[PDB]
Amino acid sequence: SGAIYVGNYRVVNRHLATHNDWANLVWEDSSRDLLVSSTTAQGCDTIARCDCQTGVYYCSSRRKHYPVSFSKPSLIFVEASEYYPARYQSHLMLAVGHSEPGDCGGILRCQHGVVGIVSTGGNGLVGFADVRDLLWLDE
Ligand SMILES: C[C@H](C(=O)N1CCC[C@H](C(N)=O)C1)c1cccs1
Numbered sequence: 072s073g074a075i076y077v078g079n080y081r082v083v084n085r086h087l088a089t090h091n092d093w094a095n096l097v098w099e100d101s102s103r104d105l106l107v108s109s110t111t112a113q114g115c116d117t118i119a120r121c122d123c124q125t126g127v128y129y130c131s132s133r134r135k136h137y138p139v140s141f142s143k144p145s146l147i148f149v150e151a152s153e154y155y156p157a158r159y160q161s162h163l164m165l166a167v168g169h170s171e172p173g174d175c176g177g178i179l180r181c182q183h184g185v186v187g188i189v190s191t192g193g194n195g196l197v198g199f200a201d202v203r204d205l206l207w208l209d210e
């Protein structure tokens with residue numbers, strides 16, 4: 072569970088999107104595990120516009136924030152699940168750290184703002200769906 076609220080937008084994991092999210096759809100990318108829906112209320116999360124590779128993420132399965140070094144967004148293979156078949160997920164960043172099913176949605180932040188949200192995990196690794204390239208979220 073977890074979303075980013077910037078302007079009139081809500082950024083969630085596509086596999087966790089609700090009926091309301093789909094009925095108020097703006098953009099969705101299955102390959103990125105991302106969905107953006109429209110909100111009535113105005114959001115105040117600052118999206119980072121950078122090439123930072125160090126940050127801090129929220130881990131609900133531990134109730135702790137964790138500093139991580141993370142990779143640059145890229146096509147990483149992700150194993151089959153009840154939401155998607157085996158495939159390469161684009162714009163994915165990996166870090167050594169704890170992630171469990173229930174942790175998707177946790178925000179990764181650097182000094183510049185929100186970088187992305189927890190999207191994958193397992194094997195002592197955590198994967199983040201990057202949002203920095205989505206410049207339309209600001210306007
Ligand atoms: C094993 C599972 C995972 O990697 N999944 C399932 C949920 C959907 C993920 C995806 N991005 O396709 C893959 C997770 C462990 C920790 C957080 S999610």
Ligand SMILES: [Zn+2]
Pocket residue numbers: 119120121122123181182183184
């Ligand atoms: Zn940054």
